[PDB]
Amino acid sequence: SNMYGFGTAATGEGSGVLFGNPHWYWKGPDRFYQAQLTIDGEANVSGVSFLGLPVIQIGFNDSVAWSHTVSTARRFGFFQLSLVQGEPTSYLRDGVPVKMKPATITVPSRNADGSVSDVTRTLYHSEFGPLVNLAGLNPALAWSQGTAFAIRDINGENFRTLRTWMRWNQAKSLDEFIAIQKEEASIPWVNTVAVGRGSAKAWYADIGAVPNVSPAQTAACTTPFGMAVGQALPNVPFFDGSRSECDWLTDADSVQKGAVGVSRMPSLQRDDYVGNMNDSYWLANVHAPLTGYPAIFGPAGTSAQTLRTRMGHTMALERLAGTDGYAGNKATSAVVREMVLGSRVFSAERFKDEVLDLICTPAQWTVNGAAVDAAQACAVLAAWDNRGRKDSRGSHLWDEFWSRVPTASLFTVPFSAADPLNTPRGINAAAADALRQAMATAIARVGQSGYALDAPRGEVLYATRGGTRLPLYGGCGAMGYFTITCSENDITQGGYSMDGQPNASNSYMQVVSFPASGVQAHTFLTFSLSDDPASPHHGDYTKAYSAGQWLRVPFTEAEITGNADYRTATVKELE
Amino acid sequence: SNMYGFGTAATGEGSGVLFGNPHWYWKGPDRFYQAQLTIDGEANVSGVSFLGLPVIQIGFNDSVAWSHTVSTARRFGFFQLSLVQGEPTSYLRDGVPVKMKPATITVPSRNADGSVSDVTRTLYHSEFGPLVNLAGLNPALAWSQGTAFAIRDINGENFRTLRTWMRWNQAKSLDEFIAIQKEEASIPWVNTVAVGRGSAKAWYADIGAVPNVSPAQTAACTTPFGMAVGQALPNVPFFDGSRSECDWLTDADSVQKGAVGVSRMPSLQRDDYVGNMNDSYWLANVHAPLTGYPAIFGPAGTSAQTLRTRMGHTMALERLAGTDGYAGNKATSAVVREMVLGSRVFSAERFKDEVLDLICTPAQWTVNGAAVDAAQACAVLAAWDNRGRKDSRGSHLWDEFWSRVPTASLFTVPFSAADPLNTPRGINAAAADALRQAMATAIARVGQSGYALDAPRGEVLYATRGGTRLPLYGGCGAMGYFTITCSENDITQGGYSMDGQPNASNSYMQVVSFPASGVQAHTFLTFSLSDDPASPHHGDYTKAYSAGQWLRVPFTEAEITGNADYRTATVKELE
Amino acid sequence: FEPGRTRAPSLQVG
Amino acid sequence: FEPGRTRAPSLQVGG
Amino acid sequence: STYSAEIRRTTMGVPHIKAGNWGSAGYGFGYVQAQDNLCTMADSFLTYRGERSRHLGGSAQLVYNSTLGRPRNIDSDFFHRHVISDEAVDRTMAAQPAKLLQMVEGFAAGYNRYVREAKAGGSAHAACRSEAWVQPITARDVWRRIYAANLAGGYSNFAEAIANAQPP
Amino acid sequence: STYSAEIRRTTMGVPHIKAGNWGSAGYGFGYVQAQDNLCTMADSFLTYRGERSRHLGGSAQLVYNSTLGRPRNIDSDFFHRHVISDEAVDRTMAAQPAKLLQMVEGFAAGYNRYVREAKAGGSAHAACRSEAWVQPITARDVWRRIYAANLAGGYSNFAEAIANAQPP
Ligand SMILES: O=C(O)Cc1ccccc1
Ligand SMILES: O=C(O)Cc1ccccc1
């Protein structure tokens, strides 16, 4: 997921601009559903909910617009239980035995022959949360006579989340939005960015529900099992549940027991921009990095950022620098609408020429002892515009190549926290053999798919509606796309079809601003509103997305009633 | 898989006719490859091997033709081990400690990021065979301080299988073929049927390598876990490996230790026919049922046969009664070639009229509280020819329906061993609601697929080659097809495409006879010889199969050199 | 031992 | 404990 | 005392629900979501109630990917019944403001209204409209789904592992 | 001595190998099988040798369905190394007639000849011809594949279970 909040200095208008771009499911019940709710004297809000949720989770009203991205902050931990021996369904706490609480559950299950069998299991809870089978994580982690494991999710006891989005749906300013976020400290697993009418600064926060452990606890309470799997579960507290001093802590300003207090969770307001593309809070704005917050929120300088994070902040900086090829140097709603679909590929922009210089002369190779003719791959890539637009040619060769390049010792300029957008970089001449291996395989895979090496991307990457393959643009985060359209289909099985259950991709998108006349929002719901192939709303929006045609979504009563497709009907029944 | 051997009472000629029809993989290294090997003075054999095998496994020579189908006889068992105190990698044999044999194995493994690292495990053998983790079968079955489990496959010690096929490749008569089968007792997990030049009798056997346990041992040696899991592992001996009295037994005429002796394995010779379609040896010929062989071979008179077995014996009887619509009443090569592709559907032949009479008047239903209009489904199915030929209309609606009908309480006339082709039968009027639910689902699924209820089967079931969808015929065993073309693709994902990794389907087919002038064989290799889409032999045989045009495969030197496509070349090198 | 935790394997070769 | 027996689960929600 | 919602649809079918109170707003919103996505939603309420296996078989995977991933139905059903117990639902609902309790009651009623219409006839949701698992739901079932969304960062990732925790 | 085989191909590409001895028949048969199916075969030799993970990742599944089913590469590798050990290969080979050992040596040599040809050039097997896992094999490797086919009714069905059997 990506989001930006541009402040008034960045937009040059009297209002900021909010860009919401969750990358999310195209099918299933967690997919988004776009709607407006107008509740007399109470709320008037528009945006999306997951199917089955009743309040708007990403959206806007007349006063504030906001979005979310999944946060790096861990939200769960494990507790290693020391068992009362001979009684493996009890565990010790400071030397006193505690019974696990059993639940005998019967599930009816339909058989091949039509009959129904009951399936019965007794499952358990500890004071921390449910027991969990960790033998799959490592066989040494079985529930034995001596040891079991429980998982605690901070959100299992957080009953505040829906109420928080409800209050945001109602909020009449960004100040109020901020106050609600702080009062509730409930946001369960995402960052938030918001822009408000009449506010100069955009808001970023990872203020929500987060386990609270101290560095001294992590050192004292992590069990030897915990240390041995800690690298598989980075920042997840894996603690000795037999010791009460290893319970999650509570701060004087914690809203929930065991959770991080409000003043120790990261946020930032900026006149220019904030953004997030799923790395930690560190670079909400690259000019003003955030540091010093609890380790569980993720690294703030020890780790290189993803290619998508590098691409997303590069796009913001180049817009405000006026060096991205769009007119002017302000992040206006109109320019943001274009920039976020522009499908630049960071890995190609930064590394393609160096890779081609290093491996394309000569263009006939010996790879694993076999003759490989790379002349067409080299020429097609040299000519390619480094974008995944519908008409871009050879972009899918780059996808098959870059995704296969080994990363160890690939770069000669290592990550530097002083420049996390431009490092690491510098393709290592010593990688030449490995890069040719990766390119030979790419060439072979594109060959097997039946597409030409220089096929336009919209023939490779598409969504079928009504029997017609609508051409798409964008790509996968691993290549350094910001515009995400990321198929789970192997290219050799009919190309990058978006028709199955694709990887997290562009879903609900909104660009929202607050001109003097009233909030204005431009939206997409890329997969369309309805899952029913017979509905006119199964493919209409997707046809618009393929065309790059943002929908101006009506908001005021006059806009709704004046809409060219307006229909109304009233549903009523006795409560 | 299916096979028939017709003897001379059925052919009315001086030799029998063999039909081999393994249903098997269309991709992968177990798939068949058709070839002839002529080794001067030693062998001249034609047929198929799995890729990577060097002798013919199913085929013919100038004197005998044979085929195989997977046998119901279990080929393995488990041994539950009683572990030596304090040494969970030792087990007790009649109270004496025996150490398991360790192997510490290191496998190099490529990572996410393209680096390679070592993975090391120490794994174990017992005197029975390798240790096996049975926790996935049921959690109580874990390797604990007191108990472990080993698996014994009698083929683990059977080094005779390849040489038995080699000897069969060289055999000069059906008599010799039989003697080889009995002398080697090595066939590892298949039935065998064969026919010979100049022999009146066709041969059926399940004579090969099979674990040898007595009823007394099954009663006394099966441990409590063995009892508890036995229903998931029918007829698999699950024995106490701490007692030497539970070791598999050796008969006086056992070729291999722990295997069933030659005279206690089923075989049958008939002048009319033998056949098998994957049920046990019982009904190799319906007029002369075989009984009294070891339990491990499977049921002989107490289990209903599958619909495909009922269909395959029905086809043989009706050929010999002259009541199936083909010419005369003999199973000659020419008639057998047409009969085995005829794509009759047993479930529809036997039950479609009873179903439609029960559910189709009225054809406006209430199904789970919902109005359902079944009038077009009823009318399409009534008009349908009960076949899965390329032009058959509605056959896919039948597949989507029958595969969903609850078989518990479906039939009112149970299985009778005295009428095994025609029982169970009698659609139960109490199943009407359940049948309407299945039909409503089937209508919904065909609706989601894009095909009309009355689409010709050739548009739904197809193999694509060179961009063209070649229409196919046949279907899945579950509906009582004999002619198997059984896609793993859901109909709603583009129909019954055969282009992925279909379920076991028609693959190498041979119809082999021995007229005076020499053996004659007509064949298919349905998916074509080569897995490379560039090859002219990736799709040529598939186009012939779609057309039903059997290949007359040349076999004599004059036939090979006289073939319209003949090319030759020599490959030679040192050593 | 609980039958509500048995997972039958595949046993038909092919 | 054998580190190489470890199989990490998928911790990124939506990922 | 009646739910009443005015449903206005514009380009791309986006619904703009207008109502005089929260329960009625829930009523219109549950109705439009079901009208457009009944097959996905009806399948989902089997998930959250732990009733997939009854209808679809225990060894089949979830139909749709989501924050739960696609475990086997039997394990998903154990996970939801154990973690989203009636006790968890009681505690969740006991913490809520009356307006949201009313909204969710209305949402279940709106969804149910649409199920009645789809069972009665129509060319819509032909893929599932006659299935047994297209059925009315309760406000508790919607709280099940709401609580489920909370757990994406933690419990949801260990659904099978929680369903299979057993002492030796 | 020299392997020498005559390859005659007829309609549908069916090859009829003619040779004066068993080693030479194996040479011609290994050659034509590779010539038509190199990609499936080269992938399969990784399976029987326990070398899939090195090239394709331990966590990826087998590419093709077969009697082995599609376990993860790492588990398959361990299964094949443990069960189709060098001893099992030694014992298998010690039990064979000279003519069959000669045939299987010819077969390896004929497969390897085709590997040399694919590495040098040509429009065939574009999908895999330049990959590292296309590589010569030995007679012992062919014996591993031959023994693997014997195991379909027993050990093949429990490959992951055998690979993961470990004391507590
Ligand atoms: O935040 C995301 O990246 C995905 C998501 C965002 C907000 C709410 C649900 C899902
Ligand atoms: O026999 C079968 O049904 C399948 C099969 C594959 C290979 C050899 C013999 C049989």
Author numbering:
A (entry chain C), B (entry chain F): 1 to 575
C (entry chain E): 8 to 21
D (entry chain B): 8 to 22
E (entry chain A), F (entry chain D): 11 to 178
What are the paper's exact sentences on this?
The crystal structures of MacQ, both ligand-free and in complex with the reaction products of decanoic acid (C10) and phenyl acetic acid (PAA), were determined at 2.6 Å, 2.2 Å, and 1.75 Å resolution, respectively. The results suggest that the more hydrophilic HSL/6-APA diffused into the solvent immediately after the enzymatic amidohydrolyzing reaction. The atomic models of PAA in two different conformations fit well to the observed electron density and were refined with reasonable B-factor values in all active sites. The C10/PAA was accommodated in the highly hydrophobic active-site pocket created by the side-chains of Trp24β, Phe32β, Phe50β, Gln57β, Ile58β, His68β, Val70β, Trp165β, Trp189β, and Val190β.
The recombinant MacQ protein exhibited bifunctional acylase activity against various ranges of AHLs and against multiple β-lactam antibiotics, including penicillin G, ampicillin, and amoxicillin. The MacQ protein is comprised of 806 amino acid residues, including an N-terminal signal peptide, and belongs to the N-terminal nucleophile (Ntn) hydrolase superfamily.
